Amino acid sequence: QVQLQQSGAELVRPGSSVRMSCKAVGYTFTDYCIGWIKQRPGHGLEWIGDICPGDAYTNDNEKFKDKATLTADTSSTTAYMQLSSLTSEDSAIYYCARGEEQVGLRNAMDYWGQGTSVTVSSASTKGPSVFPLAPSSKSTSGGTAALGCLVKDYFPEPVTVSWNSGALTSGVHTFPAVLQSSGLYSLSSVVTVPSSSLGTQTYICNVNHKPSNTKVDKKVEPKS
Amino acid sequence: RAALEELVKLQGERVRGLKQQKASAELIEEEVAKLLKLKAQL
Amino acid sequence: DIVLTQSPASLAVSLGQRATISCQSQSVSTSTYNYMHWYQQKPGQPPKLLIKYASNLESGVPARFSGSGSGTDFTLNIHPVEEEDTATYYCQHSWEIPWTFGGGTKLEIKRTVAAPSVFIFPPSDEQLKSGTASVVCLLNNFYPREAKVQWKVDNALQSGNSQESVTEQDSKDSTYSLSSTLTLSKADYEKHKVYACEVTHQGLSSPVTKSFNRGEC
């Protein structure tokens, strides 16, 4: 199977330099070019440049002349992109994708990496506070009740939320994070459950914020 | 065969050079088609 | 550089109907091949190649997707449209450096009107210790996306002190959900009693209000 395995998310300060990797397997590394693509909200997709391993050369985008630098290591079949002089405009998700055959026609990009999110900020990492969204006592006796967890004041993105260690998925809505005026993020995660289960069944939201090593298991129950 | 492998290797480096030179897409087609023709003989 | 103009920027199509997305630019075709390609990108996911060289369907991609056109005009077609097809669709050329993408087309799946289920949540006592009170209103599984959330505290209308988030269109039932968070200081919160969330939606023949009393069990 052809796979492009990229490196993890990065939080870096303005003016600094970052370097991400793209591990390519399942095919002959030097027979294809690898494209780099920039995606940030409101700007769709943008081609950064191509790297063509082996007798390495690059296809360049003038708009990324001094911003991006493309290299490759054939022995480890890994492509690298370095972003320098980082500003807020560099905050985006970066994909690597297998492009054209080096001796073939011009082509699209078929196999994509899962992307590497780059956050350019001078703000400090902060773990979230998790508060219960307790089910109302007004809940219809034989109907449907709603409960959840409030995940407040964290930086940066993202936080992941599951329910009962991922066993409970039906009726679950985890809302997109909203940037508060304090510069900190916040979101909610809700789930609809039978009202007859409120007093007897367990509901635990599993909040995880990787950048701050924060893991919280919050049990949500009717407030007495 | 070695004489024919030499043609494929060279033609494959022809289409590479033209790509490095940012040549037109029409030209790349023609040269890739040449390589394809040579590869079918091997 | 080569500019790819997509149309429309956004589209809403009913189940089983046809979706037509257009891409216009300068000639990116030779007399033999058409160097325009199509991608699908769903939220939280990398873009996925659908069509290469204008009309070649990638293996694994359903036959409902198809592409056509040449030279300056290219069209992506989806028929019939299904719930899981809600995504942003991009065109891209591989004519000459630099490769550029179209602006993208956001495809929404159209369904019958669904009224939102409304829930209101009081702030936890744990949060009140920190000195901040958050009140949340939940709008669950509704369509269309347009909804009006009005916060009331002791029958006083609020403004500028709330933020709402909306989920992506569900790829199975084509509904949306909405959460609105009312942020108050502990002092301002404890000086009042009745906290109400008023919701106005097309599926509702009248505004629906959920409420609670501060201190009430």
Chain B residues whose CB is inside 8 A of the A57 CB are 20
> Residue C30: which residues within 8 A CB-CB, separation 6 or more?
B25, B26, B29
Looking at the structure, do residues C92 and C127 belong to the same domain, yes or no? Answer: no
Give me C42's structure tokens. 């769903």
Of A52, A57, A105, the CB nearest to B32: A105
Angle between helices B25-39 and B2-20 (to 10 degrees): 170
Whether C119 sits inside 8 A of A146 (CB atoms) is: yes
Structural domains in chain B, CATH included, are 2-39 (1.10.287.10)
> Residue C100: which residues within 8 A CB-CB, separation 6 or more?
A46, A47, C1, C2, C3, C4, C92, C93
Q: How far is A112 from chain C (nearest CA, A)?
A: 7
Beta bridge partners of A150: A131, A188
> Residue C180: which residues within 8 A CB-CB, separation 6 or more?
C136, C137, C139, C149, C151, C162, C163, C164, C197
CB distance C22 to C73 below 8 Å: yes
* HSE toward the beta carbon, residue C176, CA cutoff 13 A: 21
Rg (CA), chain B: 11
Looking at the structure, do residues C101 and C10 belong to the same domain, yes or no? Answer: yes
Whether C30 sits inside 8 A of B25 (CB atoms) is: yes
- From which experimental method does this structure derive? X-ray
| Domain enclosing residue C138, as ranges | 117-213
Can you give the CATH number for the domain in which C88 is found? 2.60.40.10
Q: From the CB of residue C191, how many other CB atoms can be counted at a distance below 10 Å?
A: 12
Looking at the structure, do residues C91 and C122 belong to the same domain, yes or no? Answer: no
Q: How far is A185 from chain C (nearest CA, A)?
A: 11
Report the C-alpha gap between C136 and C152 in whole angstroms. 12
Looking at the structure, do residues C106 and C121 belong to the same domain, yes or no? Answer: no
Tell me which residue of B35, C209, C46 sits closest to A102, measured CA to CA: B35
Amino acid at residue number A168? L
User: For A42, which DSSP code?
Assistant: T
Looking at the structure, do residues C154 and C201 belong to the same domain, yes or no? Answer: yes
Chain A residues whose CB is inside 8 A of the C47 CB are 37, 45, 95, 112
Number of domains in chain C: 2
CB distance A120 to A14 below 8 Å: yes
Looking at the structure, do residues C89 and C9 belong to the same domain, yes or no? Answer: yes
> Residue A22: which residues within 8 A CB-CB, separation 6 or more?
A4, A5, A6, A7, A34, A78, A79, A80, A81, A96, A113
Q: C80, C110, C140 — which closes off a domain?
A: C110
CB distance A102 to A33 below 8 Å: yes
Q: How far is B4 from chain A (nearest CA, A)?
A: 17
Chain B residues whose CB is inside 8 A of the C32 CB are 29
Q: What are phi and psi of A84, to 5 degrees?
A: -115, 165
Whether B25 sits inside 8 A of C35 (CB atoms) is: yes
Structural domains in chain A, CATH included, are 3-120 (2.60.40.10), 129-219 (2.60.40.10)
- The structure tokens 């494929």 sit at B8
Give me C84's structure tokens. 């899981």
CB distance C194 to C153 below 8 Å: yes
Looking at the structure, do residues C82 and C166 belong to the same domain, yes or no? Answer: no
Q: From the CB of residue A182, how many other CB atoms can be counted at a distance below 10 Å?
A: 10
Q: C110, C135, C162 — which closes off a domain?
A: C110
For A64, the 3-state DSSP assignment is helix
Report the C-alpha gap between A76 and A54 in whole angstroms. 12
Rg (CA), chain C: 23
Q: Does B28 touch chain A (CB under 8 A)?
A: yes
Give me A94's structure tokens. 């970066």
For C98, the 3-state DSSP assignment is coil
> Residue A199: which residues within 8 A CB-CB, separation 6 or more?
A222
- The structure tokens 């009331």 sit at C152
Tell me which residue of C83, C71, C87 sits closest to C21, measured CA to CA: C87
Chain C residues whose CB is inside 8 A of the A113 CB are 46
CB distance C186 to C128 below 8 Å: yes
Q: What are phi and psi of C194, to 5 degrees?
A: -85, 115
CB distance C117 to C110 below 8 Å: no
Q: C66, C82, C110 — which closes off a domain?
A: C110
Contact map slice: A 75-94 vs C, CB within 8 A: none
Looking at the structure, do residues C21 and C85 belong to the same domain, yes or no? Answer: yes
Rg (CA), chain A: 22
> Residue A203: which residues within 8 A CB-CB, separation 6 or more?
A147, A163, A164, A168, A191, A193, A219, A220, A221
CB distance B29 to C30 below 8 Å: yes
Beta bridge partners of C20: C77
User: For A125, which DSSP code?
Assistant: P
Of C33, C53, C179, the CB nearest to A175: C179
Q: How far is B10 from chain A (nearest CA, A)?
A: 11
Testing the interface with A: which of B16, B39, B42 to mutate, by most A Cβ within 10 A? B16
Amino acid at residue number A118? V
Resolution for this model in angstroms, one decimal place? 2.3
Looking at the structure, do residues C10 and C102 belong to the same domain, yes or no? Answer: yes
Looking at the structure, do residues C65 and C125 belong to the same domain, yes or no? Answer: no
Give me B33's structure tokens. 């088609």
Beta bridge partners of C183: C134
- Going from the C-alpha of A18 to that of each of A4, A57, A84, C18, the distances in angstroms are 19, 21, 6, 44
CB distance C80 to C109 below 8 Å: no
Q: In Å, how far from its chain's centre is CA A112?
A: 15
Q: In Å, how far from its chain's centre is CA C161?
A: 24
Q: Does A137 touch chain C (CB under 8 A)?
A: yes
